[PDB]
Design a protein around this motif. Structure first.
Motif, PDB file in Angstrom:
ATOM      1  N   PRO A  60       5.018 -35.287   6.140  1.00 59.88           N
ATOM      2  CA  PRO A  60       4.840 -34.550   7.392  1.00 59.88           C
ATOM      3  C   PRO A  60       5.986 -33.610   7.705  1.00 59.88           C
ATOM      4  O   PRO A  60       5.714 -32.552   8.290  1.00 59.88           O
ATOM      5  N   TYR A  61       7.188 -33.991   7.278  1.00 58.98           N
ATOM      6  CA  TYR A  61       8.390 -33.178   7.472  1.00 58.98           C
ATOM      7  C   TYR A  61       8.605 -32.044   6.471  1.00 58.98           C
ATOM      8  O   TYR A  61       9.690 -31.853   5.912  1.00 58.98           O
ATOM      9  N   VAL A  62       7.530 -31.294   6.254  1.00 62.10           N
ATOM     10  CA  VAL A  62       7.464 -30.272   5.230  1.00 62.10           C
ATOM     11  C   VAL A  62       8.450 -29.161   5.564  1.00 62.10           C
ATOM     12  O   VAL A  62       8.977 -28.475   4.682  1.00 62.10           O
ATOM     13  N   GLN A  63       8.777 -29.012   6.850  1.00 62.22           N
ATOM     14  CA  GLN A  63       9.785 -28.018   7.181  1.00 62.22           C
ATOM     15  C   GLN A  63      11.171 -28.401   6.668  1.00 62.22           C
ATOM     16  O   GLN A  63      11.877 -27.539   6.146  1.00 62.22           O
ATOM     17  N   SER A  64      11.564 -29.664   6.799  1.00 61.85           N
ATOM     18  CA  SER A  64      12.859 -30.077   6.242  1.00 61.85           C
ATOM     19  C   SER A  64      12.877 -30.015   4.713  1.00 61.85           C
ATOM     20  O   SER A  64      13.854 -29.600   4.083  1.00 61.85           O
ATOM     21  N   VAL A  65      11.774 -30.414   4.085  1.00 60.07           N
ATOM     22  CA  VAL A  65      11.588 -30.158   2.658  1.00 60.07           C
ATOM     23  C   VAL A  65      11.840 -28.702   2.246  1.00 60.07           C
ATOM     24  O   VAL A  65      12.582 -28.469   1.301  1.00 60.07           O
ATOM     25  N   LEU A  66      11.187 -27.767   2.924  1.00 57.73           N
ATOM     26  CA  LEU A  66      11.301 -26.350   2.628  1.00 57.73           C
ATOM     27  C   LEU A  66      12.714 -25.867   2.911  1.00 57.73           C
ATOM     28  O   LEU A  66      13.172 -25.015   2.148  1.00 57.73           O
ATOM     29  N   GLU A  67      13.391 -26.439   3.910  1.00 55.83           N
ATOM     30  CA  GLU A  67      14.782 -26.075   4.129  1.00 55.83           C
ATOM     31  C   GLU A  67      15.617 -26.551   2.962  1.00 55.83           C
ATOM     32  O   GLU A  67      16.512 -25.819   2.544  1.00 55.83           O
ATOM     33  N   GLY A  68      15.303 -27.741   2.449  1.00 57.46           N
ATOM     34  CA  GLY A  68      15.970 -28.279   1.278  1.00 57.46           C
ATOM     35  C   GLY A  68      15.666 -27.392   0.076  1.00 57.46           C
ATOM     36  O   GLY A  68      16.575 -27.113  -0.705  1.00 57.46           O
ATOM     37  N   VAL A  69      14.427 -26.941  -0.116  1.00 52.27           N
ATOM     38  CA  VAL A  69      14.137 -26.083  -1.269  1.00 52.27           C
ATOM     39  C   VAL A  69      14.984 -24.809  -1.145  1.00 52.27           C
ATOM     40  O   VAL A  69      15.534 -24.297  -2.125  1.00 52.27           O
ATOM     41  N   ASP A  70      15.070 -24.293   0.072  1.00 53.96           N
ATOM     42  CA  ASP A  70      15.835 -23.068   0.328  1.00 53.96           C
ATOM     43  C   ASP A  70      17.293 -23.305  -0.042  1.00 53.96           C
ATOM     44  O   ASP A  70      17.908 -22.454  -0.682  1.00 53.96           O
ATOM     45  N   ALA A  71      17.844 -24.460   0.313  1.00 52.23           N
ATOM     46  CA  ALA A  71      19.239 -24.699  -0.019  1.00 52.23           C
ATOM     47  C   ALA A  71      19.422 -24.918  -1.515  1.00 52.23           C
ATOM     48  O   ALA A  71      20.496 -24.606  -2.032  1.00 52.23           O
ATOM     49  N   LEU A  72      18.412 -25.425  -2.227  1.00 48.52           N
ATOM     50  CA  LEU A  72      18.673 -25.905  -3.580  1.00 48.52           C
ATOM     51  C   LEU A  72      18.237 -24.976  -4.713  1.00 48.52           C
ATOM     52  O   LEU A  72      18.761 -25.022  -5.837  1.00 48.52           O
ATOM     53  N   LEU A  73      17.220 -24.176  -4.422  1.00 52.84           N
ATOM     54  CA  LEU A  73      16.513 -23.497  -5.509  1.00 52.84           C
ATOM     55  C   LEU A  73      17.300 -22.226  -5.863  1.00 52.84           C
ATOM     56  O   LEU A  73      17.831 -21.558  -4.974  1.00 52.84           O
ATOM     57  N   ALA A  74      17.359 -21.937  -7.159  1.00 51.96           N
ATOM     58  CA  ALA A  74      17.934 -20.704  -7.698  1.00 51.96           C
ATOM     59  C   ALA A  74      17.296 -19.524  -6.974  1.00 51.96           C
ATOM     60  O   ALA A  74      16.152 -19.564  -6.506  1.00 51.96           O
ATOM     61  N   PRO A  75      18.076 -18.438  -6.836  1.00 49.77           N
ATOM     62  CA  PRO A  75      17.501 -17.263  -6.193  1.00 49.77           C
ATOM     63  C   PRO A  75      16.230 -16.797  -6.920  1.00 49.77           C
ATOM     64  O   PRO A  75      15.290 -16.355  -6.237  1.00 49.77           O
ATOM     65  N   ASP A  76      16.193 -16.933  -8.249  1.00 47.32           N
ATOM     66  CA  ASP A  76      15.001 -16.627  -9.062  1.00 47.32           C
ATOM     67  C   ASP A  76      14.210 -17.853  -9.515  1.00 47.32           C
ATOM     68  O   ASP A  76      13.548 -17.878 -10.568  1.00 47.32           O
ATOM     69  N   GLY A  77      14.288 -18.921  -8.724  1.00 47.73           N
ATOM     70  CA  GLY A  77      13.562 -20.128  -9.130  1.00 47.73           C
ATOM     71  C   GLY A  77      12.173 -20.225  -8.523  1.00 47.73           C
ATOM     72  O   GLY A  77      11.717 -19.336  -7.799  1.00 47.73           O
ATOM     73  N   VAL A  78      11.518 -21.351  -8.784  1.00 55.25           N
ATOM     74  CA  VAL A  78      10.168 -21.575  -8.269  1.00 55.25           C
ATOM     75  C   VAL A  78      10.064 -23.001  -7.732  1.00 55.25           C
ATOM     76  O   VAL A  78      10.620 -23.929  -8.313  1.00 55.25           O
ATOM     77  N   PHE A  79       9.326 -23.138  -6.635  1.00 55.51           N
ATOM     78  CA  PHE A  79       8.945 -24.448  -6.106  1.00 55.51           C
ATOM     79  C   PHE A  79       7.460 -24.578  -6.411  1.00 55.51           C
ATOM     80  O   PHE A  79       6.667 -23.781  -5.928  1.00 55.51           O
ATOM     81  N   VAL A  80       7.111 -25.597  -7.198  1.00 55.06           N
ATOM     82  CA  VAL A  80       5.733 -25.692  -7.678  1.00 55.06           C
ATOM     83  C   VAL A  80       5.237 -27.064  -7.231  1.00 55.06           C
ATOM     84  O   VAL A  80       5.942 -28.058  -7.408  1.00 55.06           O
ATOM     85  N   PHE A  81       4.062 -27.099  -6.615  1.00 51.84           N
ATOM     86  CA  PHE A  81       3.580 -28.430  -6.220  1.00 51.84           C
ATOM     87  C   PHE A  81       2.073 -28.444  -6.395  1.00 51.84           C
ATOM     88  O   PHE A  81       1.389 -27.443  -6.199  1.00 51.84           O
ATOM     89  N   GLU A  82       1.565 -29.637  -6.690  1.00 53.07           N
ATOM     90  CA  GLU A  82       0.135 -29.761  -6.833  1.00 53.07           C
ATOM     91  C   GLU A  82      -0.335 -30.976  -6.013  1.00 53.07           C
ATOM     92  O   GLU A  82       0.319 -32.011  -6.027  1.00 53.07           O
ATOM     93  N   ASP A  83      -1.456 -30.823  -5.311  1.00 52.19           N
ATOM     94  CA  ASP A  83      -1.986 -31.840  -4.400  1.00 52.19           C
ATOM     95  C   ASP A  83      -3.490 -31.655  -4.266  1.00 52.19           C
ATOM     96  O   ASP A  83      -4.047 -30.580  -4.562  1.00 52.19           O
ATOM     97  N   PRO A  84      -4.156 -32.696  -3.733  1.00 57.23           N
ATOM     98  CA  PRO A  84      -5.595 -32.590  -3.530  1.00 57.23           C
ATOM     99  C   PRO A  84      -5.991 -31.370  -2.694  1.00 57.23           C
ATOM    100  O   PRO A  84      -5.395 -31.048  -1.662  1.00 57.23           O
ATOM    101  N   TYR A  85      -7.014 -30.687  -3.205  1.00 62.24           N
ATOM    102  CA  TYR A  85      -7.414 -29.377  -2.679  1.00 62.24           C
ATOM    103  C   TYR A  85      -8.473 -29.441  -1.599  1.00 62.24           C
ATOM    104  O   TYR A  85      -9.467 -30.116  -1.802  1.00 62.24           O
ATOM    105  N   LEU A  86      -8.271 -28.790  -0.459  1.00 65.70           N
ATOM    106  CA  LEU A  86      -9.207 -28.911   0.650  1.00 65.70           C
ATOM    107  C   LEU A  86     -10.584 -28.404   0.153  1.00 65.70           C
ATOM    108  O   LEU A  86     -11.615 -28.921   0.544  1.00 65.70           O
ATOM    109  N   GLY A  87     -10.600 -27.383  -0.696  1.00 65.42           N
ATOM    110  CA  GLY A  87     -11.882 -26.858  -1.197  1.00 65.42           C
ATOM    111  C   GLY A  87     -12.709 -27.913  -1.906  1.00 65.42           C
ATOM    112  O   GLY A  87     -13.943 -27.987  -1.721  1.00 65.42           O
ATOM    113  N   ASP A  88     -12.058 -28.656  -2.796  1.00 68.73           N
ATOM    114  CA  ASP A  88     -12.764 -29.762  -3.438  1.00 68.73           C
ATOM    115  C   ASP A  88     -13.164 -30.861  -2.471  1.00 68.73           C
ATOM    116  O   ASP A  88     -14.251 -31.412  -2.648  1.00 68.73           O
ATOM    117  N   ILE A  89     -12.295 -31.223  -1.519  1.00 68.07           N
ATOM    118  CA  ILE A  89     -12.709 -32.298  -0.616  1.00 68.07           C
ATOM    119  C   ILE A  89     -13.994 -31.940   0.148  1.00 68.07           C
ATOM    120  O   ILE A  89     -14.863 -32.792   0.336  1.00 68.07           O
TER     121      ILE A  89
END
Ligand SMILES: Cc1cn([C@H]2C[C@H](O)[C@@H](COP(=O)(O)OP(=O)(O)O[C@@H]3C[C@](C)(N)C(=O)[C@@H](C)O3)O2)c(=O)[nH]c1=O
Ligand SMILES: Nc1ncnc2c1ncn2[C@@H]1O[C@H](CSCC[C@H](N)C(=O)O)[C@@H](O)[C@H]1O
Ligand SMILES: [Zn+2]
Length: 405
Positions: free
Chosen positions: A174-203
């Motif tokens: 639920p705290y996806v904003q703190s996650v994204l702040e963490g990605v912002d602090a950690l990820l290379a300027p040219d990096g990628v955050f990649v995630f996969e999860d159940p898709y609302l379209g399929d559900i």
């Protein structure tokens, strides 16, 4: 009235699944029958179109030392993550000294390939027993939740990450904003955050309401992920549909304008707008089909009992908690559930209290029917259970509709 976890907008409910137990709490038969329940219901933010639950279960109730799900128990998934890991080694991790961080590495299903490639890495896995299984494979793991602060710690000591990856994990948070702040602090300027999860379209397409339970806080779509990225300074630059877990999307986020989005991003956004995937009316129609499946599934199971036919379940999935508790299905209708997970065997399923038995116990003489809760694993499971069907036992599925085969 509930505020959106992504943008603070208003969440309007469209589906109420009632009181639910924790999905992965399996009690021993002797254990006292109380347990924590919470109200499981789902809504859509008015501003950003994020589909999400309206009550959060505290993280520490869900993720701790007895987390019973060990990702490496599926051969399909082992292969799925090995390939993902190789794909990254061939593209994003070609640097000198690359670094990859995985959020929710569990028993090290993905990171094992990275480690075996000699690439520097770190798993975050707050659930200490699965964390231990990963360290046993030689993988570097921190028993901590990924969030703004622990991401800052990792940046400080290990420097930037070329890839941050999360599978079946970001939707749990639920705290996806703190996650994204963490990605912002950690990820290379040219990096990628990649995630996969159940898709609302399929559900929505399969009415797979059992994808809604305590650890699935968000049902992401391209539309809502694009909005969330944009709002945090990132950009959705690629999408890929995946068939695992009943239908997923792998989302690739880069920092805003660092890369050009693939054609696949616009194409999926357009399909969703065209199909009105996230319109409240579509989601309400889905909710109406949810009730229909409940009503048809219970009618079937009570008909089976009245005709003297035995019924068990197959797969003590987290998902099955939503089915058994919403539908009112317990041991008088489905006698046992067969499952490969040692930590779930000789226990009762949550809320409904159906006994779980080892899969090795599903054998001649077979029951007449097996309700397939592990329906996302159908091919893998049915390949191991030919004798059952040869003997005349039949599967009962409820996705995308109640049917027997
Ligand atoms: C393949 C196979 C599985 N089984 C049994 C093993 C598991 O108990 C369950 C399958 O669960 P499966 O659909 O994978 O996850 P679940 O809905 O629980 O959901 C869990 C919870 C979690 C982390 N929150 C998540 O998001 C997804 C990734 O995983 O089914 C067999 O008996 N025989 C088999 O051959
Ligand atoms: N904030 C956080 N940071 C990292 N991992 C987390 C987390 N919150 C929960 N988790 C972990 O996320 C996992 C979700 S289960 C999915 C595991 C694996 N990636 C797979 O795809 O099969 C659990 O092991 C859980 O303990
Ligand atoms: Zn919102």
């Amino acid at each position: 009235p509930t505020a959106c976890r992504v943008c603070g907008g208003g969440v309007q409910e469209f589906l109420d699944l009632g009181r639910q137990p924790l999905s992965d709490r399996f009690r021993k038969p002797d254990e006292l029958d109380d347990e924590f329940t919470y109200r499981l219901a789902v809504g859509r933010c008015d501003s950003c179109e994020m589909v999400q639950l309206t009550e959060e279960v505290p993280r520490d109730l869900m993720f701790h030392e007895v987390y019973p799900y060990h990702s490496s128990g599926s051969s399909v998934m082992r292969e799925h993550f090995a390939m993902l890991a190789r794909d990254f080694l061939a593209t994003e991790l070609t640097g000198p000294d690359p670094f990859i961080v995985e959020i929710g590495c569990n028993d090290g299903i993905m990171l094992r390939t990275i480690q075996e490639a000699g690439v520097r890495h770190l798993g975050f896995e707050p659930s200490s027993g699965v964390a231990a299984k990963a360290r046993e494979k030689g993988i570097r793991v921190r028993t901590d939740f990924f969030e703004k602060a622990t991401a800052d710690d990792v940046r400080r000591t290990e420097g930037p990450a070329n890839v941050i990856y999360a599978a079946n994990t970001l939707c749990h948070i639920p705290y996806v904003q703190s996650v994204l702040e963490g990605v912002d602090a950690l990820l290379a300027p040219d990096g990628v955050f990649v995630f996969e999860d159940p898709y609302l379209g399929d559900i929505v397409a399969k009415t797979s309401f059992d994808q809604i339970y305590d650890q699935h806080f968000f049902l992401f779509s391209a539309t809502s992920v694009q909005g969330m990225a944009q709002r945090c300074g990132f950009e959705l630059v690629d999408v890929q549909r995946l068939p695992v877990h009943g239908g997923e999307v792998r989302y690739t986020l880069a920092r805003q304008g660092s890369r050009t989005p693939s054609a696949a991003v616009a194409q999926l956004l357009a399909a969703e707008r065209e199909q009105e995937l996230s319109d409240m009316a579509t989601l309400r129609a889905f909710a109406g089909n949810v009730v229909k499946i409940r009503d048809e599934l219970t009618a079937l199971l009570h008909r089976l009992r009245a005709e003297g036919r035995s019924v068990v379940g197959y797969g003590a999935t987290a998902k099955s908690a939503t089915v058994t508790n919403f539908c009112g299905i317990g041991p008088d209708l489905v006698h046992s559930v067969y499952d490969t997970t040692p930590d779930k065997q000789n226990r009762l399923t949550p809320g409904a209290h159906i006994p779980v038995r080892p899969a090795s116990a599903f054998s001649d003489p077979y029951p007449d029917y097996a309700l397939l809760f592990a329906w996302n694993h159908a091919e893998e499971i049915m390949a191991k259970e030919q004798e059952f069907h040869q003997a005349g036992g039949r599967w009962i599925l409820y996705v995308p509709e109640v049917h027997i085969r």
